Design an enzyme around this catalytic site. Structure first.
Site, PDB file in Angstrom:
ATOM      1  N   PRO A 143     -42.246  34.022  51.653  1.00 52.48           N
ATOM      2  CG  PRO A 143     -42.843  35.150  53.619  1.00 52.48           C
ATOM      3  CD  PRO A 143     -41.753  34.311  53.008  1.00 52.48           C
TER       4      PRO A 143
ATOM      5  CG  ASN B 149     -43.653  18.324  42.548  1.00 50.97           C
ATOM      6  OD1 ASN B 149     -44.489  19.190  42.329  1.00 50.97           O
ATOM      7  ND2 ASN B 149     -42.524  18.264  41.891  1.00 50.97           N
TER       8      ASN B 149
ATOM      9  CG  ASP C 284     -35.205  23.470  35.722  1.00 49.30           C
ATOM     10  OD1 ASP C 284     -34.606  22.394  35.876  1.00 49.30           O
ATOM     11  OD2 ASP C 284     -36.460  23.529  35.622  1.00 49.30           O
TER      12      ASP C 284
ATOM     13  CB  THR D 274     -64.071  31.494  32.489  1.00 46.64           C
ATOM     14  OG1 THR D 274     -64.695  31.215  31.224  1.00 46.64           O
ATOM     15  CG2 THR D 274     -63.680  32.967  32.467  1.00 46.64           C
TER      16      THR D 274
ATOM     17  CG  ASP E 194     -63.341  28.270  38.935  1.00 46.38           C
ATOM     18  OD1 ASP E 194     -64.507  28.218  39.393  1.00 46.38           O
ATOM     19  OD2 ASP E 194     -62.932  29.270  38.314  1.00 46.38           O
TER      20      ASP E 194
ATOM     21  CG  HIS F  62     -37.359  19.492  35.097  1.00 49.13           C
ATOM     22  ND1 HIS F  62     -38.013  20.686  35.316  1.00 49.13           N
ATOM     23  CD2 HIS F  62     -38.033  18.539  35.782  1.00 49.13           C
ATOM     24  CE1 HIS F  62     -39.023  20.462  36.138  1.00 49.13           C
ATOM     25  NE2 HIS F  62     -39.066  19.168  36.426  1.00 49.13           N
TER      26      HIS F  62
ATOM     27  CG  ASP G  73     -48.177  33.492  46.761  1.00 51.39           C
ATOM     28  OD1 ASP G  73     -48.701  34.107  47.730  1.00 51.39           O
ATOM     29  OD2 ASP G  73     -46.962  33.135  46.735  1.00 51.39           O
TER      30      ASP G  73
ATOM     31  CB  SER H  92     -41.353  21.278  38.511  1.00 55.28           C
ATOM     32  OG  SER H  92     -41.963  20.152  39.220  1.00 55.28           O
TER      33      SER H  92
ATOM     34  CB  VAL I 287     -40.939  34.328  45.614  1.00 51.93           C
ATOM     35  CG1 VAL I 287     -39.651  35.054  46.007  1.00 51.93           C
ATOM     36  CG2 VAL I 287     -41.071  32.950  46.278  1.00 51.93           C
TER      37      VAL I 287
END
Length: 279
Positions: free
Chosen positions: A175, A161, A39, A16, A260, A69, A200, A224, A177
């Site tokens: 939308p 990014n 990837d 939290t 947050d 990666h 999301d 990523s 995913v």
């Protein structure tokens, strides 16, 4: 369970508040779930994978991750030290060459591959796909991601990014995913993280320590890198029976830490992935 001195991302996903270092998670740790890491491949031989990683598909001369990666992101998903879901099965689909690049058609093929391949795999708790890649908008990339999701795979994708609205990137803008933004350890939107209404969820994305090729480790930054935290989280959640592939994105958003993050543009969700684990 409690992993002390955990990478901050892991600690953050089970907290939290920011600024703690211990990752807390139900020991089931995504056992019986599968996460495909679509990837650059995965160095399955990395001791951090404990034989739970394998390459299932490549579109290039080798299935070896000569970039790192994919290994890094597989590590975030499910490595023993750096992973969210420390008992999940990782499947590598190398759609990206060792320079990190792939044609959309390859990427599309990879996604369709997963949608079928999961029927070859033992994943009683469910299947996740982690796509820490991104290009400009492509309806066909989006539709592949949507098929993958539709197939009953929890598809997590990187917002991108570009410090832009992710509407112009694919598969980010699909939308159906789970489009994942990046946060830093001070609960700031990562400076590079894309944003927008298609997002999301956010996950840890700045300075993410995970596995790397050559049996090593490193810290890198990107949406990523946030993506696998959400994929791992989904796999973790699915193993606990808390959600399914179809609803995992929504479940994570419902149970996220709300409000947050700072520097979240207006219109973008202020939701940080959270395991809600209570020790």
């Amino acid at each position: 369970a409690a992993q002390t001195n955990a990478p901050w991302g892991l600690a953050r996903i089970s907290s939290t508040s920011p600024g703690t270092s211990t990752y807390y998670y139900d020991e089931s740790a995504g056992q019986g779930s599968c996460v495909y890491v679509i990837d650059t491949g995965i160095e399955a031989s990395h001791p951090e994978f404990e034989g739970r990683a394998q390459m299932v598909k490549t579109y290039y001369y080798s299935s070896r991750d000569g970039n790192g990666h994919g290994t890094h992101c597989a590590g975030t998903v499910g490595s023993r030290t750096y992973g969210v879901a420390k008992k999940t099965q990782l499947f590598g689909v190398k759609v990206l060459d060792d320079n990190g690049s792939g044609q959309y058609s390859t990427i599309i093929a990879g996604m369709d591959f997963v949608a079928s391949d999961k029927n070859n795999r033992n994943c009683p708790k469910g299947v996740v796909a982690s796509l820490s890649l991104g290009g400009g908008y492509s309806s066909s990339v989006n539709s592949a991601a949507a098929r993958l999701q539709s197939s009953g795979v929890m598809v997590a994708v990187a917002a991108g990014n570009n410090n832009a609205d992710a509407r112009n990137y694919s598969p980010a803008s699909e939308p159906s995913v789970c489009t994942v933004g990046a946060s830093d350890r001070y609960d700031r939107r990562s400076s590079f993280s894309n944003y927008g209404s298609v997002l999301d969820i956010f996950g840890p994305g700045t300075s993410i320590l995970s596995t790397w090729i050559g049996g090593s480790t490193r810290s890198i930054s990107g949406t990523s890198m946030a993506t696998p935290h959400v994929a791992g989280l989904a796999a973790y959640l699915m193993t606990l029976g808390k959600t399914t592939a179809a609803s995992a994105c929504r479940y994570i958003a419902d149970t996220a830490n709300k409000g947050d993050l700072s520097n979240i543009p207006f219109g973008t969700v202020n939701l940080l992935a959270y395991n809600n684990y209570q020790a």
